[PDB]
Amino acid sequence: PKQTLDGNTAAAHVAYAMSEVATIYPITPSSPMAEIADEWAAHGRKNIFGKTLQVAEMQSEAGAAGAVHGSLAAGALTTTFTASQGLLLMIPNMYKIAGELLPCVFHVAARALSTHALSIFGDHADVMAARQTGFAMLSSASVQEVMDLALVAHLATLKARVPFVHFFDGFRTSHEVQKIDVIEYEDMAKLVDWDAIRAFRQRALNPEHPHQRGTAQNPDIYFQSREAANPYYLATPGIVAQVMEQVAGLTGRHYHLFDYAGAPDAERVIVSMGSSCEVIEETVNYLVEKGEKVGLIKVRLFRPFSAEHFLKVLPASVKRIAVLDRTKEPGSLGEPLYEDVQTVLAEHGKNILVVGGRYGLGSKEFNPSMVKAVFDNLAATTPKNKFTVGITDDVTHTSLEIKEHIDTSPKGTFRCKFFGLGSDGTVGANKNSIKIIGDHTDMYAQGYFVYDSKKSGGVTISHLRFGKQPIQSAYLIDQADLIACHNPSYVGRYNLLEGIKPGGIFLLNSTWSAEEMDSRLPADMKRTIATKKLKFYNIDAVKIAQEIGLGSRINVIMQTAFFKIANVIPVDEAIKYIKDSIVKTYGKKGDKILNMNFAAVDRALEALEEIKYPASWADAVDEAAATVTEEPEFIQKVLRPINALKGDELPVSTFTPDGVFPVGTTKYEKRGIAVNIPQWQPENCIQCNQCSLVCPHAAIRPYLAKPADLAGAPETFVTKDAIGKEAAGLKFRIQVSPLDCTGCGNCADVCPAKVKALTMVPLEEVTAVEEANYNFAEQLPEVKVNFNPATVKGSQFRQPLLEFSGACAGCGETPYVKLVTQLFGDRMIIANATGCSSIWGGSAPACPYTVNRQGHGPAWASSLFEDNAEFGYGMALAVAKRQDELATAISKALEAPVSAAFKAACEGWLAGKDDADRSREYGDRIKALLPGEISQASGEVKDLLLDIDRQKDYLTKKSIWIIGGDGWAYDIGYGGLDHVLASGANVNVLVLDTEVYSNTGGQSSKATQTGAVARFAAGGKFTKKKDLGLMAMSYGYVYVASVAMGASHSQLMKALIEAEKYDGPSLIIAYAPCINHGINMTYSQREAKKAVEAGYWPLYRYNPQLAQEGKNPFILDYKTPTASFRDFLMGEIRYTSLKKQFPEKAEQLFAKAEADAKARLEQYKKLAE
Amino acid sequence: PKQTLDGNTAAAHVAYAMSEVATIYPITPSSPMAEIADEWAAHGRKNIFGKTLQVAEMQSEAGAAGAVHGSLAAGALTTTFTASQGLLLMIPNMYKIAGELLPCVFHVAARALSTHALSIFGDHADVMAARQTGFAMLSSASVQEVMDLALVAHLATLKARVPFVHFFDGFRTSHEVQKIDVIEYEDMAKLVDWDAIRAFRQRALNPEHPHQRGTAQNPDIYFQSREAANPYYLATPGIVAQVMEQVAGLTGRHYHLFDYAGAPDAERVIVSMGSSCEVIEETVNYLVEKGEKVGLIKVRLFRPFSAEHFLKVLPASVKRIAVLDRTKEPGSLGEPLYEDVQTVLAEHGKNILVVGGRYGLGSKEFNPSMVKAVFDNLAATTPKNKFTVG
Amino acid sequence: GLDHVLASGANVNVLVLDTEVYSNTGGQSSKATQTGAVARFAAGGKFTKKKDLGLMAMSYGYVYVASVAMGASHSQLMKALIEAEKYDGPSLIIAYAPCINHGINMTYSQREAKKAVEAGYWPLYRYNPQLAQEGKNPFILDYKTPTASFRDFLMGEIRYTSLKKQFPEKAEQLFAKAEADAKARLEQYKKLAE
Ligand SMILES: CC(C)(COP(=O)(O)OP(=O)(O)OC[C@H]1O[C@@H](n2cnc3c(N)ncnc32)[C@H](O)[C@@H]1OP(=O)(O)O)[C@@H](O)C(=O)NCCC(=O)NCCS
Ligand SMILES: Cc1ncc(C[n+]2csc(CCOP(=O)(O)OP(=O)(O)O)c2C)c(N)n1
Ligand code: SF4
Ligand code: SF4
Ligand code: SF4
Ligand SMILES: [Mg+2]
Ligand SMILES: [Mg+2]
């Protein structure tokens, strides 16, 4: 049948049919394969063996690879899905699996490796890093080929006993939706070598016919034993070739080990691999029809590399070859495929000039204009070798120049771009628009989707295509027949009409009248509309949504308008298909919600307005640029162009060679995405600063000011006398940053005043006012105050050093780190694990960690997902080493003829160099006396003082903080964390427990509680939550504390200060509410209070210092819960969806979860009593 | 002075002098390096910084690699010792360490990888499995060269900011005892680029001058940012070459990126790497004195592969080359060094017949009788390609 | 990986042969090495106390954990092995295995394990989750009161006497810490049993 799928589903489709067990671990962009395989098992899909696939989630990809090896050796056909860093962690087991000749298929969504920086996007770095494991390697270039070649790999591995890596380009193919021919399970079983399967069962480990495998060998036989497998690798190319003929007989589609396309007498040929082959073949057709003698060699079977099948498809007329590698091996003579082509051509005496290039790293664009630049370089007098395409390399001059733009798209292919907001449905609608066209026309359909790095409120760009000819355009839309803008705020921000075809359609959502368009639209936009003679349409999708009560959901309104103007299918038939997709997509929401979306379709047709514009719009003149601002060089050259969606224009010279970025750059974003912002009521405020504490973006803060500093204050900067003996005679005000606020509403919910001092007002009503208020409050001078930092009110008078991050509105993670920066940010270094905390904490080019007025702030670094504890442990070793070098220079300064005041501060520092307060006290005296002391010294004495001045940044004791999610702490990094905590180092580990893998979509973890439903746990998690805090207490010398900000403000303050002052390992497990729980984020703080009150989350503190005082180290801060446990679970979707999915098993799990919470509570009572 | 050492101690000798922290995890045959480094610290041996080396044992080699990355990023010169399966578990962190241009030296006692069976004995399977990480790779062929080239790697990594894997054949060199010239710590500190060390301290993570490293990047800038480190990799071969001249002035022993030995008018040349070069040079002397026109190219700097320095030492009379790889990549068109030689010779239009072979897997014997069998195959009417010896 | 497999609940039997060193590779330090013992990569002796693997696996509640020693009690080893295998779930057996890297006469290898339990150096316990389903206490302490001197047992093995020969001034400090840690571990097993 024909279905519109993505590469991942196409791979999972074949893999589910051919496998009995599948051990998985989530990683973008390969995790969707395991997600849909888990869902199919929950709904009972049968494979060719008549059973459901068993999905096992491990603690890492290393654990997954070991389980595959055991499952295969024990007699079960096993597969797995992974990519990038995950594939690397499987490489040690891959040597064993290939070495023992076990039939197996790894499906890889090829993704870049973390080098100078993390990139979740696609290239061949991961696959190339395992090319020496002995696995075969088969590449899919299109969604159709993912379907076909996955079946080829599963069929071939049974015959050859050589394991296969079937890999396709991450996102570019794994996430591209296409209408493809799906191969039925019944046909696959008709092609399976059943004799080979039964023989594989006979080799299984079984006590009734035992054997030994995986021995240890001496040098006498290891070499011979390694060569004994050679016949299997010699025979594999022929086996893959014959399997490819079986697929041809079934599908009619002919694949070969190496495929050729282009002129039969071509002289310039490109050799390439992956999705680029689609783009190159599209360009080759265009160039051959124009008379050029060019061709293309598609590499399907990369390993084993069959020299015979490569030369078999190389025309005898070929004189120059360019090999394209989607990877980079620094310092190497050439990239992997390039050295293979060069070798085989040398082995057969072909005198052909070969040149290699790099492309598409991290999903870099690779379009036909680039393919011609590669072909044209081959036509040059001296072709440049070791080149790059798609960047401007003005440093090393490896980039090819894209001289001209060509359009190689087949005639008759419709092209569409859609600009939408997050959570408005634009992307979901275009997914169903493709299903409408593909399921109901003879046309091929294709859709690729671009999301922002931000978690919510970010721009999304949808690229769709459909034509009578097959769609090989594996690149973004060059020239669009239609462009739609689903958010009017983008008007004036982004070049929406780039590449719009003349006489094309432009679709807009706004409340602007045909007359108001002259003022609200930019001149360059009005110029393009009139010059290219575009059909301009507009619909007030917002008003239609509010009249029916749909809210912000406008996709159905805009989708209906699309089929109305695009004339892809007659509008009468199109509307029927749109109503059907509402049930199939939004059915699970309600019966009333569907009739509200059905009425939206009808009112959308009637409210579509074609705008007749004056032809004089062609002569509209750009606005006068307001007085420019003097922003830093990095903000001007890097941050602004990237946010303006022009980052691809930046040359290589823009960037540092080691991925180092400045701090405090998110304050320059000013996104202004809030619908409502808090408005402060000065008469109702008790001056408690709780609103600044819970703000997930540091957008609301208290400000103190002497009465003289209120000179240039706006009329709306109303102040009140400051309460407290420390701030006597001062003014107080709670001020919000309107452009950085997210509108979550957490600050208003926590406000404990009798009358609410914070009320939610719409942003647009008070944005002009509150902007002037914040701009004045931000420029207030620092005010030294003696408020106790150990209290909530005192801590918020300290400047926050984590501001305006990319976390979700109301995130439960960022409030924790923000409080830490206000207490110890002056002198702390952060080792952050990969996860949400690394995505909102360190996504280029914006850094949310900032500095204070003295220029000091937290230094932030993220290495890998699995090593974060040992990463931070290494920092603690080095920082101690740097302080040791300084103490040596200080001790030598005592013996030198220096001032008596200088000697006094040095002796004071040496005694308290390991005390946070004392090292700052005597250190600052040393820093103050150094410049005058250096002026009064000479000779070697001056050199000794100059060496101390070089190291004065290590006088103040640092605070190492290791931050990560529960997925890192409970699973993949627990082994490393256990070792770091057991070592006794003076580090502070902060675990942000969201009980799911929040970054990757919300997958199951050992931190997930009983009965909760998450991805890879479709039927609910049976096993109870792993008690990380209890195991770390077994050492006795590790400080462990369980906190929850929403439950108790005072308990969080005490645990944070006690853990940091502890001269040893400290572990803080913080409850962080998350959107993957399925709750209203406005009450995120309230959800944490209900968690502790219902016995769902414990609050305790284990202090080893109390044991040294003869006291009990364990303190139970909450003994008797007062709320119902069952009522708290029903307040979150992650537990209610269990009743909707598996209703009969749901009631059993709720009883187990409540019994486990009482057994955990009574266990904490025994340790306390 | 002259002392009788093994390769491991010779490597540990230089590594202890040049490093402040060393995170380790035991694995044969590399664990003796960390064992003797731990003993020296207990007895208070001072490095060129006047302090004792801090040895930290982790829960795995993966934990060791992460600690090196953190210790380097925080401002301490760090090293480690590993091999075989241990080196594989460090490969994910090696991409970060090389990608962030941190000066570092991994000392590897090259050992076979566990495939159909475990083997604690020596070959280049481990080193070849990380040749795409961006680390430089420097090979020692004798106990004397372990001493000298370890110093070259530690000195070069400070100048180039490119991390080095200094590897020597497991057991065959790491456990071979030889009377060698030991280089004094005082001479090493006289060769250290102290300006480079202080600059490396300035890049450390510190709250009083903070920065962000290791960000997450979208497709718009990841490619450009990856190519921005190219000047460092282009300059590394020249830096290693000049560092090799410093060692020559101190020791009198001349190393090059690629070294040649044999007849000046040789027509059959072997390209090889590691301890086999000692055996091949011994055979070449024997064959040249008997009138045969044969030669040998020793590969010292395997990565970055400098095409210029390789062709610089290739006699113009060479007509046939046999490349020897102490590793096996099943199904591949050829083994790693073989494809490198074949590529550079193709890039410069040399019409030379090249053939590749495999040897010495899991410390398989490689003796001069085998070296002649390789040379005699080059003399055949049709030399066999993709062969094995031993 | 072991923590994940035991937490999964699979019907597997994990047998940990605890030699407190990396015996194959020459005798290097491990988290299983006790306080004060000298091994490779711990030239000055291990400061941190022994990691309690058995105690952490008991935190799950559904994992059978047992500490055995053949030289100490033949009958206790038989019961723990049969109970752990019949348990339809994860079972963890931590067995004390004397080794040459301890520095003792291997003729009395069995005798050294008996002295280990009798001096409070090695515990003998069994955690049965099936006892919890019967309303009973899952933890059984099979050896409550030690009868031998703790300091005398350490001096019977070279891995502790070489500390007095290498670092004599720090050696007496570590012996007091090792004996205090064994009593705190023993009283902690008494609280779970009482
Ligand atoms: C997908 C994403 C870009 C938002 O896209 P979009 O243009 O808003 O389109 P979507 O189809 O996702 O939005 C529909 C959502 O809004 C709601 N929706 C929109 N219109 C609706 C309507 N009329 N009726 C009912 N629900 C509607 C739904 O609740 C749905 O969310 P849910 O089904 O997950 O609860 C964003 O959520 C995202 O970035 N996701 C993760 C992307 C990723 O793959 N990341 C890799 C991990 S690092
Ligand atoms: C070795 C490796 N495996 C998997 C991944 C993919 N990955 C990134 S973040 C993440 C999980 C994050 O979950 P968590 O640790 O709980 O942090 P959170 O997002 O919830 O804050 C995963 C699996 C990776 N980057 N590296
Ligand atoms: S939470 Fe309310 S009472 Fe407290 S400082 Fe903020 S506005 Fe004032
Ligand atoms: S609404 Fe949310 S983001 Fe805005 S100020 Fe209040 S807490 Fe901060
Ligand atoms: S942890 Fe949850 S709420 Fe916070 S940013 Fe990640 S997905 Fe959003
Ligand atoms: Mg999480
Ligand atoms: Mg052991």
UniProtKB/Swiss-Prot annotation, chain B:
Family recorded in the similarity comment: Belongs to the pyruvate:ferredoxin/flavodoxin oxidoreductase family.
Record text on subunit structure and interactions: Homodimer.
Source organism (scientific name): Moorella thermoacetica (strain ATCC 39073 / JCM 9320)
Residues at which pyruvate binds: T28, R111
Protein name from the UniProt record: Pyruvate:ferredoxin oxidoreductase
Full-protein positions shown: 2 to 391 of 1171
Function per UniProt: Catalyzes the oxidative decarboxylation of pyruvate to acetyl-CoA and carbon dioxide. The two electrons that are generated as a result of pyruvate decarboxylation are used in the reduction of low potential ferredoxins, which provide reducing equivalents for central metabolism. Also catalyzes the reverse reaction, i.e. the synthesis of pyruvate from acetyl-CoA and carbon dioxide. Appears to function physiologically in both directions. The oxidation of pyruvate by PFOR is required to connect glycolysis and the Wood-Ljungdahl pathway of reductive acetogenesis.
